[PDB]
């Protein structure tokens, strides 16, 4: 909320989100992110690059998560 409860999700997500496959996907996210900002009459909306990033991250999330969860 403001500061006090240690979300294992947030903890393990950092290490996860980082990693190779997600670095690259987030790169395209930002790439495409900045394209859509740079215009007006556009519609190529970045929905896809987000999910790809999430997939790669989330697979690694599941694998490493629940171990600590009590």
């Amino acid at each position: 909320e403001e500061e006090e409860l240690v979300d294992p999700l947030t903890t393990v997500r950092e290490q996860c989100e980082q990693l190779e496959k997600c670095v690259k996907a987030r790169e395209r996210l930002e790439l495409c992110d900045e394209r859509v900002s740079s215009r007006s009459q556009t519609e190529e909306d970045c929905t896809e690059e987000l999910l790809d990033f999430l997939h790669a991250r989330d697979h690694c999330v599941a694998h490493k998560l629940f171990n600590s969860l009590k």
Binding site: L5, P8, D33, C46, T47, L50, H55
Partner: protein, 241 residues
Amino acid sequence: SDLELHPPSYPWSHRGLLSSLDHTSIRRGFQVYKQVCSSCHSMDYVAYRHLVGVCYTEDEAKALAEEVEVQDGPNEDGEMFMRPGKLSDYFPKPYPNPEAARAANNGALPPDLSYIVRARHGGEDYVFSLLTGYCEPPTGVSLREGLYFNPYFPGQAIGMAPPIYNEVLEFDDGTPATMSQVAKDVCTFLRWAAEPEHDHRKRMGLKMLLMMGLLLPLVYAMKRHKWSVLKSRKLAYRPPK
């Protein structure tokens, strides 16, 4: 919108073929259902007595039912009064007509919980990934300020607000109510409400495999023994001349 993402494979403690449920985890998940979910989610098919064999005891289960009011049958005047709560009743509560859910949450119904895990595609994983994996809307896709964002949702225009970090709880002995933790338990409990027979079935299934492993070779040997006469039969042709 017409694009989608599929949930990962979380190592639930009831994922294995011969794997029971964490009954301590169904409790806390019931607790999560009780306060949070219940105000909007109908669990029409589960009752208080259903919990007895599972998590709590006779006494405890009675008490939890006593913390609500039901609207019991008519008496002499043709009435409709209120009663403490038995063990016999179920959990139908939120609001009557389906339209009331719409009037409230706005033209959307928090689909009944009693059968959710078994009705999604991906079981507890879809729900867990949903609840836990809430995120922020990327470029050009504006919503309708009641249509929150979830990647794990068809079309991604969902009507449900993320209610998992609202840290409530009575993890009796001592368990931290992080978003992750409340989500495992709520899904572990949901597995149970969708499939109460879950454990017992796997106990029978274990026995089915052991029986078969004993029966299969035996019936095979019985049949081979009887087919022996034919398998080793020897023929000879002895024509005249």
